[PDB]
Scaffold this active site. Structure first.
Site, PDB file in Angstrom:
ATOM      1  N   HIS A  35      -2.428   8.930   4.196  1.00 12.28           N
ATOM      2  CA  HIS A  35      -2.655   7.524   3.793  1.00 12.28           C
ATOM      3  C   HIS A  35      -4.149   7.256   4.025  1.00 12.28           C
ATOM      4  O   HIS A  35      -4.829   6.794   3.085  1.00 12.28           O
ATOM      5  CB  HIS A  35      -1.669   6.603   4.488  1.00 12.28           C
ATOM      6  CG  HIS A  35      -1.817   5.191   4.032  1.00 12.28           C
ATOM      7  ND1 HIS A  35      -1.545   4.833   2.738  1.00 12.28           N
ATOM      8  CD2 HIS A  35      -2.218   4.066   4.662  1.00 12.28           C
ATOM      9  CE1 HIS A  35      -1.777   3.527   2.588  1.00 12.28           C
ATOM     10  NE2 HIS A  35      -2.222   3.038   3.736  1.00 12.28           N
ATOM     11  N   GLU A  94      -2.069   7.317  12.313  1.00 15.97           N
ATOM     12  CA  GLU A  94      -1.496   8.302  11.375  1.00 15.97           C
ATOM     13  C   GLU A  94      -1.708   9.726  11.926  1.00 15.97           C
ATOM     14  O   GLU A  94      -0.754  10.563  11.846  1.00 15.97           O
ATOM     15  CB  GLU A  94      -2.099   8.126   9.987  1.00 15.97           C
ATOM     16  CG  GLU A  94      -1.497   9.054   8.977  1.00 15.97           C
ATOM     17  CD  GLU A  94      -1.990   8.891   7.548  1.00 15.97           C
ATOM     18  OE1 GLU A  94      -3.115   8.324   7.376  1.00 15.97           O
ATOM     19  OE2 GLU A  94      -1.269   9.375   6.635  1.00 15.97           O
ATOM     20  N   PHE A 137       1.508  -2.866   4.880  1.00 18.63           N
ATOM     21  CA  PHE A 137       1.862  -4.104   5.588  1.00 18.63           C
ATOM     22  C   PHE A 137       3.387  -4.222   5.573  1.00 18.63           C
ATOM     23  O   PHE A 137       4.055  -3.582   4.743  1.00 18.63           O
ATOM     24  CB  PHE A 137       1.256  -5.328   4.905  1.00 18.63           C
ATOM     25  CG  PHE A 137      -0.165  -5.627   5.281  1.00 18.63           C
ATOM     26  CD1 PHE A 137      -0.960  -4.698   5.940  1.00 18.63           C
ATOM     27  CD2 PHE A 137      -0.703  -6.865   4.957  1.00 18.63           C
ATOM     28  CE1 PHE A 137      -2.269  -5.028   6.273  1.00 18.63           C
ATOM     29  CE2 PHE A 137      -2.011  -7.183   5.285  1.00 18.63           C
ATOM     30  CZ  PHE A 137      -2.791  -6.265   5.934  1.00 18.63           C
ATOM     31  N   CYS A 159       0.829  -1.227   0.000  1.00 17.44           N
ATOM     32  CA  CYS A 159       0.000   0.000   0.000  1.00 17.44           C
ATOM     33  C   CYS A 159       0.852   1.261   0.000  1.00 17.44           C
ATOM     34  O   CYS A 159       0.244   2.347  -0.021  1.00 17.44           O
ATOM     35  CB  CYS A 159      -0.971  -0.024   1.166  1.00 17.44           C
ATOM     36  SG  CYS A 159      -2.147  -1.387   0.980  1.00 17.44           S
ATOM     37  N   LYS A 170      -8.481   8.836  -0.374  1.00 16.66           N
ATOM     38  CA  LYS A 170      -9.161   7.508  -0.429  1.00 16.66           C
ATOM     39  C   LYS A 170     -10.654   7.636  -0.066  1.00 16.66           C
ATOM     40  O   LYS A 170     -11.436   6.684  -0.316  1.00 16.66           O
ATOM     41  CB  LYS A 170      -8.477   6.489   0.463  1.00 16.66           C
ATOM     42  CG  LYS A 170      -7.058   6.162   0.031  1.00 16.66           C
ATOM     43  CD  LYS A 170      -6.473   5.077   0.880  1.00 16.66           C
ATOM     44  CE  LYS A 170      -5.051   4.718   0.495  1.00 16.66           C
ATOM     45  NZ  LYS A 170      -4.165   5.910   0.544  1.00 16.66           N
ATOM     46  N   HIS A 219      -9.467   2.357  -1.733  1.00 14.52           N
ATOM     47  CA  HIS A 219      -8.042   1.971  -1.540  1.00 14.52           C
ATOM     48  C   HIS A 219      -7.540   1.239  -2.776  1.00 14.52           C
ATOM     49  O   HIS A 219      -7.868   0.028  -2.929  1.00 14.52           O
ATOM     50  CB  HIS A 219      -7.877   1.123  -0.288  1.00 14.52           C
ATOM     51  CG  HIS A 219      -6.466   1.060   0.176  1.00 14.52           C
ATOM     52  ND1 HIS A 219      -5.394   1.340  -0.660  1.00 14.52           N
ATOM     53  CD2 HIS A 219      -5.946   0.801   1.399  1.00 14.52           C
ATOM     54  CE1 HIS A 219      -4.270   1.237   0.034  1.00 14.52           C
ATOM     55  NE2 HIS A 219      -4.579   0.898   1.298  1.00 14.52           N
TER      56      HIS A 219
END
Lengths: 401, 358
Positions: free
Chosen positions: A295, A306, A389, A164, A325, A330
């Protein structure tokens, strides 16, 4: 040290194809959410994603046969053709020029992997699997097919698989490659395609919203899977000025950090280190950032962590912090590339894209998210965040030229 | 500011560790065994697996029951690189130590097991939830950072047979931009039933079911001026192309000539040349291109890798490791040039030029 500019954007997204449509979608707070058509949703208890609605590969792809690519490769190649056209570069301009082509992806052709497995399962026989799909599933192909479409043999074709965060890693690698002096152009971004693998994964993690994506909202319930591609043309300033290129924005710097902590959870300290590294590389102070493209996935864990990292670095005076997003869902490896292009357009056109579907800001995210409608602003320097991840963080800083 | 390789490690069909790898290469040892019946039906019963490799035996009982073989191979290689034979710390790392790993398509075992559960369980997200973290293509590189507390740049790149050389060039560039002072660089491929069937499906109509290997090669890379250890080799150039005309021989030739020119060396200086030896027409074309370009003695300097089988993304890392093992065994290697090249089915071609030191 060498300056690096953005001369071209190519966009295949759930809210618009092409720079003009994407700019209109961002300014309008368009939602990319629509029913899934790519695969069978029976048994998931939901069937919404942010698919690209009307993809016409024939309109952008000339040379590479379509069955040489899955949908992710087709998005990457179409967006790369749109980017070089937006940069005013022809195949003849590109041909000789030593280049980096770097595409970020999370899942690559995981839809084609699922179709191969259906063929084995229906048959009870692995011999039933289609060689045409098997030949196009490896992520490295997403970068080589762009070189094939653009007739560019003198290319370092690197697919970056940092999930991501992959788009931001790719743009950064292009920045480093041009700063090195070894190339004067890099085609950089990210591409992914909606697939059963990603939908099932997020569903089983409990990370899918039952309705809409509400980043930083007090009652946010998670993400929608998305897809598409963003490709950016990075050029040395010298090369752009010498050919009279139109410059969208400048790449000032980026930061890479690793949490070295958990394989799926975000980390406040790792995200904060990524931000500080990006600001240091860009040579800018916290006070000069006009907004942050977060993000901002709309999960409970992501947005809390975040926000806390941003508040940490910016010392209780964060800038406006928005979640693209909210509109796109996403788009996985593409998310940070489409975010980077949104940031370049925000700088060029003097607007901040909104955080849509916003009802009430989480009191633990003390941010101005520019809820629901875009604002006009003097946008000069913008931070584009990404996390993934395996603890992978990548933060990109763009500025006015 | 030339990058130098100051250490290496390997987990391969020769066994666990650089000493096993060095010995097997020198011996021309056979590595092919009959596959475990547990793997289920395969296109070929002959495989080049890492011998005596059990994930829980190697890595302990914590977070290892659901771990993918790819991740396990990278973690054991990382221990070989940073630790000595007794688990003592041999290499000092810090937040400026980068990691970059090259892959083909990660663990195809993980993603196919996941999708198989999606298709066959009562609902299509009713999967083994404990396997989900290990599925990410960047899991092996991220797991290496968790294991050794590596907060610096953490990158995974694809590209299959060239991925080790794309990783090396990526490390070289980020070190040159000051993003890292040291790097763990390499590539890895697991053996899996899913990978073996996908390779059998993808290979040219009626080609023989290939002999497949697996493993991980890793290198420690430092700046020449700052190296905390003797340099084994300087990385003089890494050049890449895409074979857009499906002429892999011409693409290899053009790539190798540019890599030698950028290194500032004549083809006649090449002391060891190791091609990837893909069991394909592209692999044979690569071999014939090199056989015309470099001294014939350079191609016979390093024992053939062919008995490891097709090692996929591990290829170029194993090729660099074979060069370093040859250099170590031959005092006359000092100051000589080595060339490593690979060609990937997806079109990328890559050549690295090294100055051997030691």
């Amino acid at each position: 040290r060498r300056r690096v500019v953005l001369t071209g954007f190519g966009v295949i997204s759930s809210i618009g194809t092409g720079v003009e449509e994407y700019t209109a979608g961002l300014r309008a707070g368009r939602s990319g959410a629509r029913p899934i058509t790519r695969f069978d949703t029976e048994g998931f208890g939901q069937n919404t994603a942010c698919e690209v609605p009307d993809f016409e590969p024939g309109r952008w792809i000339h040379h590479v046969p379509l069955d040489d690519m899955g949908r992710a490769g087709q998005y990457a190649v179409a967006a790369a053709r749109m980017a070089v056209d937006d940069a005013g570069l022809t195949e003849d301009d590109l041909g000789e020029r030593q280049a980096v082509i770097t595409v970020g992806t999370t899942d690559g052709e995981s839809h084609d992997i699922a179709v191969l497995l259906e063929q084995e399962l229906a048959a009870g026989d692995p011999e039933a699997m289609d060689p045409v799909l098997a030949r196009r599933i490896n992520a490295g192909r997403l970068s080589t097919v762009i070189a094939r479409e653009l007739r560019m043999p003198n290319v370092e074709a690197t697919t970056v698989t940092t999930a991501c965060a992959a788009g931001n890693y790719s743009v950064g690698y292009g920045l480093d490659s041009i700063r090195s002096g070894e190339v004067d152009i890099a085609l950089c971004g990210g591409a992914d395609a909606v697939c059963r693998k990603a939908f099932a994964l997020f569903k089983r993690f409990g990370a899918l919203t039952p309705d809409v994506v509400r980043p930083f909202d007090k009652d946010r319930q998670g993400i929608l899977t998305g897809e598409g591609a963003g490709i950016l043309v990075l050029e040395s300033l010298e090369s752009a000025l010498a050919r009279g290129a139109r410059i969208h924005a400048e790449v000032l710097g980026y930061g890479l950090s690793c949490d070295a902590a958990h394989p799926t959870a975000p980390n406040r300290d790792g995200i904060a280190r990524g931000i500080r590294l990006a600001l240091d590389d860009a040579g800018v102070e916290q006070e000069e950032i006009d907004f942050i493209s977060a993000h901002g996935t709309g999960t409970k864990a992501n947005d809390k962590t975040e926000s806390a990292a941003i508040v940490d670095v910016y010392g209780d005076a964060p800038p406006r912090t928005v979640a693209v997003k909210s509109m796109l869902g996403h788009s996985m490896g593409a998310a940070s590339a489409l975010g980077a292009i949104a940031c370049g357009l925000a700088i060029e056109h003097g607007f901040i894209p909104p955080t849509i579907n916003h009802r009430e800001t989480d009191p633990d995210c003390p941010l101005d998210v520019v809820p629901n409608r875009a604002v006009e602003a003097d946008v000069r320097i913008v931070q584009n965040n990404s996390s993934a991840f395996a603890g992978n963080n990548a933060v990109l800083i763009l500025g006015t030229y | 500011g030339t990058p130098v390789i100051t250490g290496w490690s390997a987990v391969s069909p020769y066994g666990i560790g650089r000493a096993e790898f060095a010995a097997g290469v020198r011996a021309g040892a056979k590595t092919a065994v009959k596959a475990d019946a547990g793997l289920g039906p395969l296109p070929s019963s002959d495989v080049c697996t890492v011998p005596g490799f059990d994930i829980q035996e190697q890595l302990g009982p914590r977070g290892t029951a659901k771990m993918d073989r790819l991740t396990a191979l990278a973690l054991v290689a990382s221990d070989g690189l940073l630790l000595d034979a007794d688990g003592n710390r041999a290499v000092a790392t810090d937040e400026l130590t980068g990691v970059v790993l090259g892959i083909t398509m990660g663990s195809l075992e993980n993603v196919t097991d996941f999708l198989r559960q999606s298709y066959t369980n009562a609902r299509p997200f009713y999967v083994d939830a404990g396997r989900i973290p290990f599925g990410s293509l960047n899991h092996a590189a991220g797991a290496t950072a968790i294991r050794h507390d590596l907060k610096g740049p953490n990158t995974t790149v694809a590209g299959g047979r060239v991925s080790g050389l794309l990783a090396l060039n990526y490390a070289r560039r980020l070190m040159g931009q000051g993003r890292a002072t040291k790097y763990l660089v390499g590539s890895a491929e697991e053996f899996s039933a899913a990978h073996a069937w996908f390779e059998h499906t993808a290979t040219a109509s009626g080609d023989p079911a290939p002999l497949l290997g697996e493993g991980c090669g890793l290198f420690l890379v430092e700046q020449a001026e700052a190296a905390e250890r003797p340099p084994l080799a300087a990385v003089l150039s890494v050049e890449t192309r895409v074979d857009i005309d499906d002429d892999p021989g011409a693409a290899v030739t053009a790539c190798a000539r540019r890599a030698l020119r950028r290194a500032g060396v004549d083809a006649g200086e090449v002391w060891a040349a190791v091609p990837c030896a893909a069991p394909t027409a592209a692999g044979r074309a690569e071999h014939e291109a090199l056989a015309a370009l470099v001294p014939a003695d350079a191609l016979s300097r390093v024992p053939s890798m062919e008995l490891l089988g097709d090692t996929g993304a591990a290829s170029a890392s194993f090729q660099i490791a074979a060069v370093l093992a040859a250099a170590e065994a031959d005092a006359d290697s000092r100051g000589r040039i080595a060339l490593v090249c690979a060609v990937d089915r997806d079109g990328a071609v890559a050549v690295a030029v090294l100055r051997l030191i030691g």
